[PDB]
RNA sequence: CGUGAGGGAAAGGUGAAAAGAACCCCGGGAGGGGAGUGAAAUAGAGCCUGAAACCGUGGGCUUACAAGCAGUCACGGCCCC
RNA sequence: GAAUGCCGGCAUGAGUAACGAUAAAGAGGGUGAGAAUCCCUCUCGCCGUAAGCCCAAGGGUUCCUACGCAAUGGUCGUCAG
RNA sequence: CGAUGUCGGCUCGUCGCAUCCUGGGGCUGAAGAAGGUCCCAAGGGUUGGGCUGUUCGCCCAUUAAAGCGGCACGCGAGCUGGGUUCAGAACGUCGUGAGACAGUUCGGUCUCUAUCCGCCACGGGCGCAGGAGGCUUGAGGGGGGCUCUUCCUAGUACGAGAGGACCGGAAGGGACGCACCUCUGGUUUCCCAGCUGUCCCUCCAGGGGCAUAAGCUGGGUAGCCAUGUGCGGAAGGGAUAACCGCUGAAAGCAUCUAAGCGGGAAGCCCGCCCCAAGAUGAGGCCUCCCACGGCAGCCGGUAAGGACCCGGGAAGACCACCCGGUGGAUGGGCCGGGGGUGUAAGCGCCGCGAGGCGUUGAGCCGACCGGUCCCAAUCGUCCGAGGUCU
C-alpha cells in the first residue's frame, strides 16, 4: 500500500452529518406486573425477582 | 400462458427407459384464483393466485377483506401469473402433462457478501511466486488518468444470491395429481422449502 | 407438509426388494443388463464390494475386480432396474465400512485381510433350508 | 480426464509403453480427454524395434481412465490406470493386439476394431 | 519496449 | 456461509469449547443453578440434558459415558441418585434458561441464569 | 536529553483584608446546591483582565429534484427593531 | 496571512486503527458505593534444559505491613513494582 | 525535477475498426470443392505448450480463427520484480591512474489503517396531500449474443478424373453463462472407530487431558461445492448495410430513383432473462380505517395498521429480509426415521498369553425428514388517520 491519508480536513458540516445516525435509542422497558417497577421485557425482574408470575430469584 | 405456485421439496432421480433422470420434485397444487386482472380494470391480463392455507389469527383486516371479496379461505402467498386466464376458480398440477417443457422461477440460495472469485469466477492471484496478500483479489479496476473512474456495472465483491432466478425449458417428467406433485427434470433455484413459480415455457 | 415423506413417495415406485443383503467385504456377482449391437444382454460383474453409500432409494455400492491385469471398479445403484439379480459368491469379514485400502494390496495381502465371514456363511446355509 | 502432460499406458503391441499427451483432439480448446477421445502424444518410452519409437508423435484413443466415467443408466466405471491405443488417421489401431479391458464407450464412437480385439469390454 | 528508467527504484518512506 | 449449521463457536477452538461445556456442566449439576452469558446458557441446555437423560437410564454404560464428560465419581453419583430421579417422568427439558435484566459492567455482556428444573 | 564533553526548558498575578466559605443537602469521592464572607465570588483558590481558534445548549430564518472558489446584484417570503 | 517560519492552543482523520505473542478459560463463595478483572474454593488449560530454583552484573527501597485509588496500569480495579 | 514510479508478466477490463474467425455481398483468370480480391459488418469469439526477463519473434500440437491498435507504450495507494538506475564482485575493453562502458556476469530493503470523487453491495431519512396491509404496469437500464463435427438430401448438381456442393433436414461436441446437489467426486476442528507416548481418575477393566490453532490414522451426514447434473445462446416479428431487383421519367432508347414498391446480415429495434415509480413525470388495481377530542396550524387519546421486545431462519457483516411468539411446533430437549461409524460396556466361553468367539449390525451418534408443549418465545409498551385550495 502507499499510506492513504485524508486530502482535506472534514468540515464541521460534514463531520456532523456523518453523525446523523449516532443517536442512542432509549432502553425498551415494560412494567413488572408484580411490583410495577420498570424493566426490560423478557428479563427476570431485578426489583422483585419475579418472572412468569412467580418468584425466580432473591433480590 | 399457464402457471402455478409451488414449494420446492427436493431432488432425486427416477428411472425412465433404462436412464437415471435427475429430478426436482415440486408441490404445486392447488391454487385458488383470488383476483383476475383485466384490461378494462387493470390495464393488462393476469391471474392473482393464492397458495398454502393460513391461520386466520394471522391475517389482518385489509387482507381478510381481499380474500372475502373472492370467497376464498385465507392463504399464505399471493402471486400473479401473466396472460393467463384459467376457466376454474382453482389451478392445480393438471395444467401440466408429462413431456411439456416449463420455466421455473425461484429465489436462489443466498451467498451473502461474496468475493469476486465466488461471484464472478475471477481468477484471483497466485498462491506463491511472491503474491503478497492478494490471492483472492480482483486485480486492476481501471486505467489511469483517462478515464479516471470506474465503469458503472464493474464486477466487484458484494451480496450474491437470494435473488429471483428463472431456469428455462425444463422437461416435465411426471405429474402426480393425487399429491399435487410436479416432477421436473434438472435443478430449480433455491432451497428445499422455498417458494417457486412454474410457467409454461417460452422456448420453442 | 412432510418433504421427506413426499420424496420417499415419489421413490416408492422404483424401490426394489428382491436383491440380497450384502456387506462391504462380500464378494458378489451383479448381472447387469447392458446395451451393444444391436441387442441388450446380461453381463456379469464379479468382485469385492468395497463400498456401500446409503441414502435410501439412492444408496449405491461399488464393486472392484481385476480384469486381465487391470483393476476395475463399477458403481451400481442398489435400486437400478438394470440389475437382473445379485448372487453372493462369498462373505468376507471387514473391520471397516469402506475398503479403499484394498486398492494397494497384493492378492495375497487381500486374502489375508478379508477372511471368510464364517458366521454369515453359516447363517446363509441356515436359510436355504426350505419347505 | 487426460490433459497435456498426462502419461498414459499404451494397451497395444505397437512397442510403445508410455505416451505423454500433448493435445486433446476435441475442438479448439477442450481441457480434458476421456474414453473414446483421441489425443496426440509423444512416445516417452518404447521397447526396442517396435512399430513406434521414443520421440515419435502419435495419435491414440483413450480406452480406459482412472477418473470414473458416468453412464446414462446411473452407473459409473473406473479403471486402475489411464491407457490408450495408438491409431492412424482412420481410427484404426496400428498394432494388432490390445491388452486389458476397454470401455464400451469406445464402440458407440466407432473404435469398433479396438473394441473387438480387446479381451474384455466393461 | 525497454527505454531509459527515469526514477531510481523507490524505497519505502524513511520515518518522519 | 453457515447454512443449516448447528452449534455456536464461542470464539474457542475445539478442545476449549468442549472443556467449556464440561466445566459448565459440572458447575450446573453441582449447584443446581449458575449464571453466565446468554449464549453460553443457551448451549448448556442440550449438553447437560443429555447427561441428565443418560443418568435416567441408570445402567453402567450410561454411567461410564457420563463420566467422560463429568469425571467426578461423586458428582455422577449425585447425578444418578438425586438428580436423575426427579425427572423420571419428565421427557426432556430438564434445564431452563431465564434472562437477567442487568448487563455486566466491565464488558456489557448480557447475562442469564441456567438451572435444573423442578 | 546525552556514555561523555555537552545540550537545556516550561512555569508570574484571589482579595483592601483570608474574611480561603461553619453548618445542612446529593455524592464513595470529585463535583455541585443552599447557607455564610466580600464593594464585587462567571474575584472560590483549575482564582485579575479573560481575545481567537475549538466544543456545546437554547432561539429566529432556512434546507431532502439539487450542480457549488460558496459570493455578489435583483426581487419576493418569513422573523425582529 | 503565507518564510515545509518560531512558541503555544485547539481542530481533522474518528468513536476509526489499535489495546503488544492464538498457553484458555468456567463456575461458586467473599469483600465493596462500585467487580469479567481483588481474595478464597473447585474445575479447565500452559511451561517444566523452564515460563522452576540459586549466583554475578546492573537497578536502588521496587521488600513486609497498615490505610488509600486522583493520576500511573493500554480496559476495570476494591488490586499493584 | 518542494517526485507525473519507469520494461515485461499477472489480474481485470473497456473501446476503435484499417476484420483474424463467424454472418451478408459484388468481381474473379469463379465448372465443383477450395482460393483470390474488394465491399458491408465490431454481436460474440479469437487455444495450450518449448525458448528467452523479454514486448516481439521463431518453433511444437491444435483451431472457425489463432486480428491489429487505443486507454499515462490501460492497470505497482491492485500483485509481481525476471529486465532496468545506487552501493559488492568479476570478465572483455578503454584509461599511467582513480575509474569508465546506447558491453557482459552473479547478488542486491517494492510503505498494515481510503477523507473526497468513482465503483460494488446494504441500510437510515424524507418525499410521493388521509392513513394503512397486499398485488402489480414497465418509462428506463442491465444481462445474453461464439462456434464446430458428423449424418441425411447425394456420392446427386458440377467434373475426363480426383474430387464434390448450393437449398432443406437430423444428431453430437468445445469453450462460456446461470442455477443446482439426485448421481459422481471433494470437504466435513470432534459424527464414529483404530493407534502410540505420557500424566491422571481408580489397582484391574473402562476412561479423560496433552502431543495443532483435530496428537496421528481410517472413514464420514447436512452444508458449502466441481471434476458432477439441468438449462441458456435462439425461434420469431420489424426496420436496415453492402448488394440484388420491380415499375419508371428526365433523356421517344436505357436507367433500382428523380414519384412509388420489393428483397437483403452473427449486426440494429422488439422478442428472452434480471433490475426498475426518488419514472419528484413519485403510475395502477384490490382490500382495510374514518367523518375523535382542546385550541393546508398546534396539542392529546385512538382506528386500520405498524414498531419495540423475544424464539429463530439455506436471509444476513451491523442494518435489512423472511418466519414464529402459548389462538404456539420458532429454537432447545426428548422420541421415531434417516445417516455415519462398523459389532459398545458388562458377562460367558476357548486360549499359558497377545488375542479369539457369542451376546450384537451392537453401542455411540452434528446439522437431514418428522412427532411431541418437557424447556423457553412470560408480561407488555409505544407510535399511528380525522384527510389544503380551484
Ligand atoms: Mg503498494
Ligand atoms: Mg491502501
Ligand atoms: Mg505490504
Ligand atoms: Mg496507511
Ligand atoms: Mg491526499
Ligand atoms: Mg471542526
Ligand atoms: Mg455543529
Ligand atoms: Mg461526512
Ligand atoms: Mg396503466
Ligand atoms: Mg418467488
Ligand atoms: Mg447465506
Ligand atoms: Mg475473490
Ligand atoms: Mg458465480
Ligand atoms: Mg469457479
Ligand atoms: Mg488463476
Ligand atoms: Mg487459483
Ligand atoms: Mg504463478
Ligand atoms: Mg515481495
Ligand atoms: Mg500469502
Ligand atoms: Mg500507472
Ligand atoms: Mg473523466
Ligand atoms: Mg440479499
Ligand atoms: Mg415416467
Ligand atoms: Mg436445498
Ligand atoms: Mg430428503
Ligand atoms: Mg462379456
Ligand atoms: Mg532419442
Ligand atoms: Mg520517503
Ligand atoms: Mg467460512
Ligand atoms: Mg437450524
Ligand atoms: Mg451456528
Ligand atoms: Mg461443538
Ligand atoms: Mg473475540
Ligand atoms: Mg476466549
Ligand atoms: Mg478449532
Ligand atoms: Mg485445550
Ligand atoms: Mg489439542
Ligand atoms: Mg440432540
Ligand atoms: Mg428470559
Ligand atoms: Mg437485556
Ligand atoms: Mg467492571
Ligand atoms: Mg549520544
Ligand atoms: Mg543522565
Ligand atoms: Mg548539543
Ligand atoms: Mg523554548
Ligand atoms: Mg493579590
Ligand atoms: Mg496579595
Ligand atoms: Mg480595593
Ligand atoms: Mg456521603
Ligand atoms: Mg466539598
Ligand atoms: Mg449539586
Ligand atoms: Mg458549596
Ligand atoms: Mg453581603
Ligand atoms: Mg462601588
Ligand atoms: Mg466578569
Ligand atoms: Mg473579577
Ligand atoms: Mg485558566
Ligand atoms: Mg487587581
Ligand atoms: Mg478569570
Ligand atoms: Mg475562564
Ligand atoms: Mg469564547
Ligand atoms: Mg442549534
Ligand atoms: Mg427531474
Ligand atoms: Mg425542494
Ligand atoms: Mg446567486
Ligand atoms: Mg429583477
Ligand atoms: Mg504576504
Ligand atoms: Mg505542512
Ligand atoms: Mg507543517
Ligand atoms: Mg510553523
Ligand atoms: Mg504564522
Ligand atoms: Mg513551529
Ligand atoms: Mg504548531
Ligand atoms: Mg480529534
Ligand atoms: Mg463503530
Ligand atoms: Mg475510516
Ligand atoms: Mg473498520
Ligand atoms: Mg482505520
Ligand atoms: Mg500498537
Ligand atoms: Mg478492531
Ligand atoms: Mg495482552
Ligand atoms: Mg491479546
Ligand atoms: Mg500460532
Ligand atoms: Mg468470580
Ligand atoms: Mg459472585
Ligand atoms: Mg473487577
Ligand atoms: Mg469495579
Ligand atoms: Mg486475564
Ligand atoms: Mg485470587
Ligand atoms: Mg512443549
Ligand atoms: Mg524434564
Ligand atoms: Mg532505573
Ligand atoms: Mg518509592
Ligand atoms: Mg524481604
Ligand atoms: Mg514498599
Ligand atoms: Mg509489595
Ligand atoms: Mg490493602
Ligand atoms: Mg487509580
Ligand atoms: Mg480508577
Ligand atoms: Mg476512578
Ligand atoms: Mg489523595
Ligand atoms: Mg492509567
Ligand atoms: Mg485505568
Ligand atoms: Mg501499556
Ligand atoms: Mg475500598
Ligand atoms: Mg503495579
Ligand atoms: Mg520531474
Ligand atoms: Mg507537490
Ligand atoms: Mg511527493
Ligand atoms: Mg501520482
Ligand atoms: Mg485491449
Ligand atoms: Mg469497414
Ligand atoms: Mg465470409
Ligand atoms: Mg465455389
Ligand atoms: Mg476449378
Ligand atoms: Mg468473395
Ligand atoms: Mg465484432
Ligand atoms: Mg463491443
Ligand atoms: Mg475484438
Ligand atoms: Mg522443460
Ligand atoms: Mg514461457
Ligand atoms: Mg517470448
Ligand atoms: Mg526476439
Ligand atoms: Mg474456414
Ligand atoms: Mg500463441
Ligand atoms: Mg504503462
Ligand atoms: Mg507516442
Ligand atoms: Mg495494451
Ligand atoms: Mg504499468
Ligand atoms: Mg509496488
Ligand atoms: Mg509493472
Ligand atoms: Mg496506479
Ligand atoms: Mg500509487
Ligand atoms: Mg492504485
Ligand atoms: Mg496513484
Ligand atoms: Mg491485486
Ligand atoms: Mg533486479
Ligand atoms: Mg538474471
Ligand atoms: Mg538481456
Ligand atoms: Mg543513493
Ligand atoms: Mg551493485
Ligand atoms: Mg551492479
Ligand atoms: Mg567475471
Ligand atoms: Mg582486462
Ligand atoms: Mg570501451
Ligand atoms: Mg592504457
Ligand atoms: Mg592497461
Ligand atoms: Mg560517470
Ligand atoms: Mg562476464
Ligand atoms: Mg542470494
Ligand atoms: Mg545484475
Ligand atoms: Mg512485498
Ligand atoms: Mg469513505
Ligand atoms: Mg474529490
Ligand atoms: Mg430507501
Ligand atoms: Mg427506510
Ligand atoms: Mg424497456
Ligand atoms: Mg433515471
Ligand atoms: Mg451420398
Ligand atoms: Mg449446439
Ligand atoms: Mg445428499
Ligand atoms: Mg455429495
Ligand atoms: Mg451422492
Ligand atoms: Mg460422496
Ligand atoms: Mg468426541
Ligand atoms: Mg491416554
Ligand atoms: Mg487400565
Ligand atoms: Mg495436563
Ligand atoms: Mg503440557
Ligand atoms: Mg504435527
Ligand atoms: Mg496445546
Ligand atoms: Mg481427541
Ligand atoms: Mg499414525
Ligand atoms: Mg474421503
Ligand atoms: Mg479425517
Ligand atoms: Mg457431507
Ligand atoms: Mg464443471
Ligand atoms: Mg450445451
Ligand atoms: Mg433475427
Ligand atoms: Mg425486410
Ligand atoms: Mg436488369
Ligand atoms: Mg425497367
Ligand atoms: Mg440518351
Ligand atoms: Mg424515391
Ligand atoms: Mg430497399
Ligand atoms: Mg429479389
Ligand atoms: Mg446465432
Ligand atoms: Mg418485478
Ligand atoms: Mg411510487
Ligand atoms: Mg414496482
Ligand atoms: Mg427526467
Ligand atoms: Mg403509488
Ligand atoms: Mg429479530
Ligand atoms: Mg440473527
Ligand atoms: Mg411479527
Ligand atoms: Mg405477546
Ligand atoms: Mg419447536
Ligand atoms: Mg423439536
Ligand atoms: Mg434424532
Ligand atoms: Mg438408522
Ligand atoms: Mg444405518
Ligand atoms: Mg464381538
Ligand atoms: Mg461386547
Ligand atoms: Mg482361562
Ligand atoms: Mg437415531
Ligand atoms: Mg399437539
Ligand atoms: Mg408489563
Ligand atoms: Zn418486580
Tab-separated table of N, CA, C and O in Angstrom, chain B residues 4-59:
chain	number	residue	atom	x	y	z
B	4	UNK	N	-48.345	-21.787	-12.142
B	4	UNK	CA	-48.769	-22.198	-10.833
B	4	UNK	C	-47.692	-21.893	-9.790
B	4	UNK	O	-46.512	-21.776	-10.128
B	5	UNK	N	-48.089	-21.779	-8.534
B	5	UNK	CA	-47.164	-21.529	-7.444
B	5	UNK	C	-46.935	-22.865	-6.778
B	5	UNK	O	-47.838	-23.671	-6.742
B	6	UNK	N	-45.768	-23.084	-6.185
B	6	UNK	CA	-45.476	-24.340	-5.517
B	6	UNK	C	-44.334	-24.180	-4.553
B	6	UNK	O	-43.717	-23.134	-4.490
B	7	UNK	N	-44.054	-25.202	-3.774
B	7	UNK	CA	-42.840	-25.210	-2.986
B	7	UNK	C	-41.879	-26.276	-3.554
B	7	UNK	O	-42.301	-27.311	-4.059
B	8	UNK	N	-40.588	-25.978	-3.568
B	8	UNK	CA	-39.578	-26.962	-3.924
B	8	UNK	C	-39.452	-27.995	-2.776
B	8	UNK	O	-39.304	-27.610	-1.614
B	9	UNK	N	-39.572	-29.302	-3.051
B	9	UNK	CA	-39.443	-30.207	-1.937
B	9	UNK	C	-38.081	-30.900	-1.883
B	9	UNK	O	-37.584	-31.216	-0.809
B	10	UNK	N	-37.459	-31.132	-3.023
B	10	UNK	CA	-36.156	-31.777	-3.024
B	10	UNK	C	-35.855	-32.537	-4.290
B	10	UNK	O	-36.710	-32.625	-5.136
B	11	UNK	N	-34.663	-33.109	-4.415
B	11	UNK	CA	-34.321	-33.877	-5.618
B	11	UNK	C	-34.197	-35.378	-5.380
B	11	UNK	O	-33.948	-35.828	-4.259
B	12	UNK	N	-34.422	-36.153	-6.425
B	12	UNK	CA	-33.906	-37.498	-6.505
B	12	UNK	C	-33.796	-37.765	-7.945
B	12	UNK	O	-33.860	-36.866	-8.758
B	13	UNK	N	-33.672	-39.027	-8.276
B	13	UNK	CA	-33.706	-39.376	-9.656
B	13	UNK	C	-34.703	-40.497	-9.841
B	13	UNK	O	-35.042	-41.200	-8.876
B	14	UNK	N	-35.260	-40.602	-11.037
B	14	UNK	CA	-36.130	-41.727	-11.333
B	14	UNK	C	-35.502	-42.471	-12.456
B	14	UNK	O	-34.557	-41.988	-13.078
B	15	UNK	N	-35.995	-43.680	-12.675
B	15	UNK	CA	-35.524	-44.472	-13.801
B	15	UNK	C	-36.561	-44.524	-14.868
B	15	UNK	O	-37.702	-44.907	-14.634
B	16	UNK	N	-36.167	-44.068	-16.039
B	16	UNK	CA	-37.088	-43.970	-17.145
B	16	UNK	C	-36.378	-44.460	-18.378
B	16	UNK	O	-35.340	-43.948	-18.700
B	17	UNK	N	-36.894	-45.493	-19.023
B	17	UNK	CA	-36.215	-46.097	-20.157
B	17	UNK	C	-34.775	-46.386	-19.914
B	17	UNK	O	-33.936	-45.935	-20.685
B	18	UNK	N	-34.496	-47.153	-18.860
B	18	UNK	CA	-33.120	-47.505	-18.501
B	18	UNK	C	-32.201	-46.305	-18.443
B	18	UNK	O	-31.081	-46.359	-18.944
B	19	UNK	N	-32.708	-45.211	-17.893
B	19	UNK	CA	-31.950	-43.997	-17.729
B	19	UNK	C	-32.215	-43.383	-16.367
B	19	UNK	O	-33.342	-43.366	-15.888
B	20	UNK	N	-31.157	-42.895	-15.734
B	20	UNK	CA	-31.291	-42.167	-14.498
B	20	UNK	C	-31.729	-40.772	-14.846
B	20	UNK	O	-31.122	-40.131	-15.674
B	21	UNK	N	-32.834	-40.329	-14.276
B	21	UNK	CA	-33.307	-38.999	-14.546
B	21	UNK	C	-33.301	-38.200	-13.285
B	21	UNK	O	-34.108	-38.436	-12.400
B	22	UNK	N	-32.398	-37.232	-13.205
B	22	UNK	CA	-32.275	-36.290	-12.099
B	22	UNK	C	-33.511	-35.451	-12.026
B	22	UNK	O	-33.888	-34.860	-13.052
B	23	UNK	N	-34.158	-35.381	-10.873
B	23	UNK	CA	-35.362	-34.594	-10.846
B	23	UNK	C	-35.456	-33.746	-9.634
B	23	UNK	O	-34.970	-34.104	-8.600
B	24	UNK	N	-36.123	-32.620	-9.776
B	24	UNK	CA	-36.611	-31.904	-8.627
B	24	UNK	C	-38.114	-32.058	-8.528
B	24	UNK	O	-38.847	-31.827	-9.467
B	25	UNK	N	-38.556	-32.487	-7.371
B	25	UNK	CA	-39.953	-32.580	-7.031
B	25	UNK	C	-40.510	-31.278	-6.445
B	25	UNK	O	-40.034	-30.784	-5.423
B	26	UNK	N	-41.551	-30.756	-7.073
B	26	UNK	CA	-42.269	-29.586	-6.585
B	26	UNK	C	-43.731	-29.890	-6.174
B	26	UNK	O	-44.485	-30.414	-7.002
B	27	UNK	N	-44.131	-29.560	-4.930
B	27	UNK	CA	-45.552	-29.489	-4.552
B	27	UNK	C	-46.206	-28.254	-5.105
B	27	UNK	O	-46.013	-27.204	-4.554
B	28	UNK	N	-47.042	-28.380	-6.135
B	28	UNK	CA	-47.631	-27.217	-6.777
B	28	UNK	C	-49.101	-26.949	-6.473
B	28	UNK	O	-49.484	-25.857	-6.005
B	29	UNK	N	-49.974	-27.899	-6.724
B	29	UNK	CA	-51.366	-27.554	-6.452
B	29	UNK	C	-51.653	-27.197	-4.976
B	29	UNK	O	-50.776	-27.175	-4.115
B	30	UNK	N	-52.898	-26.859	-4.672
B	30	UNK	CA	-53.945	-26.289	-5.526
B	30	UNK	C	-53.951	-24.774	-5.330
B	30	UNK	O	-53.660	-24.299	-4.223
B	31	UNK	N	-54.210	-24.015	-6.388
B	31	UNK	CA	-54.033	-22.572	-6.286
B	31	UNK	C	-55.295	-21.839	-6.583
B	31	UNK	O	-55.663	-21.730	-7.735
B	32	UNK	N	-55.969	-21.333	-5.541
B	32	UNK	CA	-57.236	-20.623	-5.718
B	32	UNK	C	-57.052	-19.318	-6.404
B	32	UNK	O	-56.309	-18.522	-5.868
B	33	UNK	N	-57.740	-19.053	-7.511
B	33	UNK	CA	-57.696	-17.695	-8.049
B	33	UNK	C	-58.424	-16.730	-7.095
B	33	UNK	O	-59.504	-17.022	-6.598
B	34	UNK	N	-57.776	-15.612	-6.785
B	34	UNK	CA	-58.302	-14.685	-5.796
B	34	UNK	C	-58.510	-13.287	-6.389
B	34	UNK	O	-59.209	-12.450	-5.822
B	35	UNK	N	-57.988	-13.062	-7.583
B	35	UNK	CA	-58.362	-11.871	-8.326
B	35	UNK	C	-57.939	-12.077	-9.730
B	35	UNK	O	-56.961	-12.759	-9.956
B	36	UNK	N	-58.712	-11.534	-10.666
B	36	UNK	CA	-58.339	-11.566	-12.049
B	36	UNK	C	-58.043	-10.171	-12.424
B	36	UNK	O	-58.620	-9.244	-11.877
B	37	UNK	N	-57.030	-10.007	-13.254
B	37	UNK	CA	-56.652	-8.677	-13.632
B	37	UNK	C	-57.101	-8.624	-15.033
B	37	UNK	O	-56.847	-9.555	-15.772
B	38	UNK	N	-57.801	-7.559	-15.395
B	38	UNK	CA	-58.310	-7.419	-16.746
B	38	UNK	C	-57.898	-6.108	-17.340
B	38	UNK	O	-57.654	-5.147	-16.626
B	39	UNK	N	-57.878	-6.057	-18.671
B	39	UNK	CA	-57.628	-4.825	-19.416
B	39	UNK	C	-58.496	-3.646	-19.028
B	39	UNK	O	-57.986	-2.534	-18.958
B	40	UNK	N	-59.771	-3.877	-18.760
B	40	UNK	CA	-60.707	-2.776	-18.540
B	40	UNK	C	-60.424	-2.193	-17.201
B	40	UNK	O	-60.498	-0.981	-17.016
B	41	UNK	N	-60.123	-3.084	-16.263
B	41	UNK	CA	-59.997	-2.722	-14.865
B	41	UNK	C	-58.593	-2.337	-14.509
B	41	UNK	O	-58.388	-1.352	-13.801
B	42	UNK	N	-57.642	-3.117	-15.016
B	42	UNK	CA	-56.301	-3.123	-14.528
B	42	UNK	C	-55.280	-2.747	-15.611
B	42	UNK	O	-54.143	-2.385	-15.310
B	43	UNK	N	-55.672	-2.850	-16.869
B	43	UNK	CA	-54.825	-2.445	-17.954
B	43	UNK	C	-54.027	-3.522	-18.622
B	43	UNK	O	-53.294	-3.259	-19.573
B	44	UNK	N	-54.154	-4.737	-18.133
B	44	UNK	CA	-53.380	-5.846	-18.641
B	44	UNK	C	-54.071	-7.130	-18.166
B	44	UNK	O	-55.085	-7.055	-17.474
B	45	UNK	N	-53.558	-8.298	-18.540
B	45	UNK	CA	-54.227	-9.545	-18.185
B	45	UNK	C	-53.398	-10.494	-17.316
B	45	UNK	O	-52.307	-10.910	-17.709
B	46	UNK	N	-53.939	-10.937	-16.193
B	46	UNK	CA	-53.231	-11.939	-15.406
B	46	UNK	C	-54.110	-12.488	-14.331
B	46	UNK	O	-55.190	-11.945	-14.065
B	47	UNK	N	-53.621	-13.532	-13.667
B	47	UNK	CA	-54.336	-14.061	-12.511
B	47	UNK	C	-53.601	-14.049	-11.195
B	47	UNK	O	-52.547	-14.669	-11.038
B	48	UNK	N	-54.176	-13.376	-10.222
B	48	UNK	CA	-53.601	-13.464	-8.928
B	48	UNK	C	-53.993	-14.807	-8.334
B	48	UNK	O	-55.171	-15.043	-8.076
B	49	UNK	N	-52.991	-15.652	-8.070
B	49	UNK	CA	-53.178	-16.966	-7.446
B	49	UNK	C	-52.794	-16.958	-5.981
B	49	UNK	O	-51.866	-16.287	-5.601
B	50	UNK	N	-53.455	-17.747	-5.153
B	50	UNK	CA	-53.042	-17.815	-3.769
B	50	UNK	C	-52.459	-19.194	-3.580
B	50	UNK	O	-52.591	-20.032	-4.481
B	51	UNK	N	-51.853	-19.448	-2.424
B	51	UNK	CA	-51.208	-20.708	-2.172
B	51	UNK	C	-50.907	-20.865	-0.711
B	51	UNK	O	-50.597	-19.876	-0.043
B	52	UNK	N	-50.971	-22.123	-0.250
B	52	UNK	CA	-50.861	-22.552	1.163
B	52	UNK	C	-51.798	-21.836	2.090
B	52	UNK	O	-51.809	-20.625	2.131
B	53	UNK	N	-52.577	-22.588	2.876
B	53	UNK	CA	-53.615	-22.001	3.731
B	53	UNK	C	-53.044	-21.392	4.987
B	53	UNK	O	-52.097	-21.923	5.546
B	54	UNK	N	-53.615	-20.280	5.421
B	54	UNK	CA	-53.082	-19.614	6.600
B	54	UNK	C	-54.051	-19.644	7.781
B	54	UNK	O	-55.288	-19.760	7.635
B	55	UNK	N	-53.454	-19.620	8.955
B	55	UNK	CA	-54.152	-19.361	10.189
B	55	UNK	C	-54.839	-17.965	10.198
B	55	UNK	O	-54.140	-16.923	10.230
B	56	UNK	N	-56.196	-17.926	10.198
B	56	UNK	CA	-56.965	-16.658	10.218
B	56	UNK	C	-56.566	-15.704	11.349
B	56	UNK	O	-56.665	-14.494	11.220
B	57	UNK	N	-56.094	-16.268	12.455
B	57	UNK	CA	-55.459	-15.490	13.517
B	57	UNK	C	-54.290	-14.638	13.008
B	57	UNK	O	-53.853	-13.722	13.703
B	58	UNK	N	-53.773	-14.912	11.809
B	58	UNK	CA	-52.563	-14.199	11.381
B	58	UNK	C	-52.808	-13.259	10.223
B	58	UNK	O	-51.899	-12.573	9.769
B	59	UNK	N	-54.059	-13.190	9.797
B	59	UNK	CA	-54.451	-12.420	8.635
B	59	UNK	C	-55.111	-11.105	9.038
B	59	UNK	O	-56.221	-11.126	9.570
